[PDB]
Design an enzyme around this catalytic site. Structure first.
Site, PDB file in Angstrom:
ATOM      1  N   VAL A  22      24.623   8.125 -23.356  1.00 38.67           N
ATOM      2  CA  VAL A  22      24.792   8.680 -24.826  1.00 38.67           C
ATOM      3  C   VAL A  22      25.373   7.558 -25.648  1.00 38.67           C
ATOM      4  O   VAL A  22      26.482   7.043 -25.210  1.00 38.67           O
ATOM      5  CB  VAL A  22      25.460  10.146 -24.734  1.00 38.67           C
ATOM      6  CG1 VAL A  22      25.770  10.559 -26.364  1.00 38.67           C
ATOM      7  CG2 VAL A  22      24.795  11.037 -24.151  1.00 38.67           C
ATOM      8  N   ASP A 122      22.879  24.886 -15.796  1.00 41.29           N
ATOM      9  CA  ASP A 122      23.682  23.599 -15.511  1.00 41.29           C
ATOM     10  C   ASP A 122      24.972  23.702 -16.403  1.00 41.29           C
ATOM     11  O   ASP A 122      25.530  22.741 -16.909  1.00 41.29           O
ATOM     12  CB  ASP A 122      22.877  22.344 -15.749  1.00 41.29           C
ATOM     13  CG  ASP A 122      23.421  21.049 -15.099  1.00 41.29           C
ATOM     14  OD1 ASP A 122      24.125  21.167 -14.169  1.00 41.29           O
ATOM     15  OD2 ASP A 122      23.468  19.863 -15.961  1.00 41.29           O
ATOM     16  N   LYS A 124      28.900  23.470 -16.924  1.00 33.93           N
ATOM     17  CA  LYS A 124      30.022  22.915 -16.502  1.00 33.93           C
ATOM     18  C   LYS A 124      30.810  22.352 -17.635  1.00 33.93           C
ATOM     19  O   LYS A 124      29.961  22.035 -18.538  1.00 33.93           O
ATOM     20  CB  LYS A 124      29.513  21.973 -15.232  1.00 33.93           C
ATOM     21  CG  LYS A 124      28.303  20.673 -15.464  1.00 33.93           C
ATOM     22  CD  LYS A 124      27.889  19.941 -14.410  1.00 33.93           C
ATOM     23  CE  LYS A 124      27.066  18.976 -15.170  1.00 33.93           C
ATOM     24  NZ  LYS A 124      26.598  18.115 -13.896  1.00 33.93           N
ATOM     25  N   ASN A 127      29.327  19.817 -19.950  1.00 33.29           N
ATOM     26  CA  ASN A 127      28.313  20.422 -20.803  1.00 33.29           C
ATOM     27  C   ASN A 127      28.581  21.166 -22.013  1.00 33.29           C
ATOM     28  O   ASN A 127      27.905  21.735 -22.600  1.00 33.29           O
ATOM     29  CB  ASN A 127      26.930  20.970 -19.899  1.00 33.29           C
ATOM     30  CG  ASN A 127      26.363  19.757 -19.133  1.00 33.29           C
ATOM     31  OD1 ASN A 127      26.195  18.685 -19.414  1.00 33.29           O
ATOM     32  ND2 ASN A 127      25.677  20.284 -17.959  1.00 33.29           N
ATOM     33  N   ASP A 143      22.919  19.925 -23.100  1.00 29.88           N
ATOM     34  CA  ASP A 143      22.197  19.494 -21.838  1.00 29.88           C
ATOM     35  C   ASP A 143      21.498  20.541 -21.343  1.00 29.88           C
ATOM     36  O   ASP A 143      21.734  21.206 -20.342  1.00 29.88           O
ATOM     37  CB  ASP A 143      23.139  18.897 -20.784  1.00 29.88           C
ATOM     38  CG  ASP A 143      22.698  18.159 -19.610  1.00 29.88           C
ATOM     39  OD1 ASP A 143      21.385  17.972 -19.646  1.00 29.88           O
ATOM     40  OD2 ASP A 143      23.389  17.679 -18.772  1.00 29.88           O
ATOM     41  N   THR A 162      -3.679  45.731  -6.930  1.00 24.41           N
ATOM     42  CA  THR A 162      -3.121  46.733  -5.463  1.00 24.41           C
ATOM     43  C   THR A 162      -2.768  45.791  -4.588  1.00 24.41           C
ATOM     44  O   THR A 162      -3.123  44.754  -4.448  1.00 24.41           O
ATOM     45  CB  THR A 162      -4.550  47.653  -4.991  1.00 24.41           C
ATOM     46  OG1 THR A 162      -4.228  48.217  -4.051  1.00 24.41           O
ATOM     47  CG2 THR A 162      -5.860  46.632  -4.835  1.00 24.41           C
TER      48      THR A 162
END
Ligand SMILES: CC(=O)N1CCC(C(=O)Nc2ccc(C)cn2)CC1
Ligand SMILES: CC(=O)N1CCC(C(=O)Nc2ccc(C)cn2)CC1
Ligand SMILES: [Cl-]
Ligand SMILES: [Cl-]
Lengths: 290, 290
Positions: A22, A122, A124, A127, A143, A162
């Site tokens: 990032v 995800d 955490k 994030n 994220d 069926t």
């Protein structure tokens, strides 16, 4: 080294790395900071952008732009306080009131995702992004790379026929179908446990039982000395999210109705943080006239 | 009514309906019969064609052409004997030797699918085609619309990380991961039961126990008078395919090694049917010279 694609350089002045990778950048048109997520080179990227463009919630990160080059570039809003991970790393623990304010927002965000057929998968502390360096701030879930979209299942189509030739494990799976979202609620319970206590509930540190075994039994590491500082209501909520059976586990709605979240002061502080951020975006109002 | 797209009419003379809807057609270039599967208007169609183009096995139907119009048109090879369903409908039962010859081919076909990462998921007498009106013929598996491609799972990616935030039901699912193909073996067991006996193992006719309950317990309807005509070896194989636990259930390899399939006469008859059909395709051979 390497270079940024021309289309990106055209709109953004690239700057320092913030942590896939990032980077900090400046939008030339506005002179405002943005965060640019670089994803090295696809199927998850397609789904991630599609999810991000559809979502519109104050506690969910927004996509500003996207570039498809040698690598993928996802332009996102910049969050000045960084990751919730950095506020809990080591044995750092937040004030219970700070936990509540951030947790409430995480629940609203996840509830909005579940209402819109999205499972994050995800969740955490890394994030969860904080909007400012101030402890009373807005949080944003980010994220969406591992996220899943819920639609009409192959199971739903299979049940229209069926089952003469249908295997028993397919019929056994009908009991749990549609509880996939409960994985987010488990993750929320683990984040809340960490925020309140300063330590993880399942760890390979100072124990013999395997991480797998601690999780499937749901026997979290409870340290009374650490938890004495925390309210019974807060622990009761953690206990209802850290339930092994995904069908008995608390959903985001049940967590939002929990007595620990029935705090009007916390709610007002959140409404105050919302309107303060909206103040710049706010266009004039068509007001009623008697 | 409606009309066929120009691109299809260009290469094929459309004829009578054979049964989605399947029509008889003639390839203008060769004057040979083809079957054209019409699928009304997408995601399954994309996967179906992709699967069909990759597969090359004598007991699996082949794609000859494909047209993407108001509806999808899949041009396939024509099978003159029609569906295995029509040979077993009502209480019609095949000779045990005919069952063996057709079953052996079904196992080779499914084994080839499983080796190539494909799960059919819809094996039934109506998806098995016979090459001729003669009882000793080649069979072809068809209808790959419900099929699934096996690749690198999200579970495999999930296990590469630490499960600190991972829900217990994800860890519990590790026990069964990779047994999805066993659904084809269950279906094969049901087809074999029907072929040998002339009646289905699980039925809502003349019983109180729900179809679901008969299947999940694996308590098939055994009629001794019907099964006395059948060998113990044949029934033993059915019993090993109709096992509730997908991990203990016979795989295609185990079924191919079963004593009931150790029949050189049946194998020779299959090799004889192969070379007879290949006779027209066979280009001259580069032969060794001493
Ligand atoms: C130290 C500093 O100036 N920070 C803390 C870290 C912060 C940061 O990475 N935000 C961020 C990261 C990813 C995304 C998508 C948004 N926002 C920038 C300000
Ligand atoms: C009665 C008759 O002339 N038949 C029996 C039915 C048979 C038939 O539908 N084959 C068929 C169906 C679908 C596919 C893909 C291939 N092949 C044609 C000859
Ligand atoms: Cl550059
Ligand atoms: Cl026409």
């Amino acid at each position: 080294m390497s270079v940024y694609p021309k289309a990106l350089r055209d709109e953004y002045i690239m700057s320092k790395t913030l942590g896939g990778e990032v980077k900090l950048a400046f939008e030339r048109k506005t002179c405002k900071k943005v965060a640019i997520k670089i994803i090295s080179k696809a199927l998850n990227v397609e789904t991630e952008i599609e999810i991000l463009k559809k979502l519109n919630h104050p506690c969910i990160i927004k996509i500003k732009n996207f570039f498809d080059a040698e690598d993928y570039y996802i332009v996102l809003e910049l969050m000045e306080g960084g990751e919730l991970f950095d506020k809990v790393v080591g044995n750092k623990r937040l004030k219970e009131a700070t936990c509540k304010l951030y947790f409430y927002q995480m629940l609203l965000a996840v509830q909005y995702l579940h209402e819109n057929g999205i499972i994050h998968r995800d969740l955490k502390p890394e994030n969860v992004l904080l909007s400012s360096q101030e402890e009373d701030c807005l949080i944003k879930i980010t994220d969406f790379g591992h996220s899943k979209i819920l639609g009409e299942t192959s199971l739903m189509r299979t049940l229209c026929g069926t089952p003469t030739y249908l295997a028993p494990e397919v019929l056994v799976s009908v009991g749990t179908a549609g509880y996939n979202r409960a994985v987010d609620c488990w993750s929320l319970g683990v984040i809340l446990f960490i925020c309140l206590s300063g330590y993880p509930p399942f760890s390979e540190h100072r124990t013999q039982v395997s991480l797998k075994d601690q999780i499937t039994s749901g026997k979290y590491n409870f340290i009374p000395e650490v938890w004495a500082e925390v309210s019974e209501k807060a622990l009761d909520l953690v206990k209802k999210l850290l339930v092994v059976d995904p069908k008995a586990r608390f959903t985001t709605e049940e967590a939002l109705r929990h007595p620990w979240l029935q705090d009007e002061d916390m709610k007002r502080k959140f409404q105050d943080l919302l309107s303060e951020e909206n103040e710049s975006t706010a266009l004039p109002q068509v007001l009623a006239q008697p």
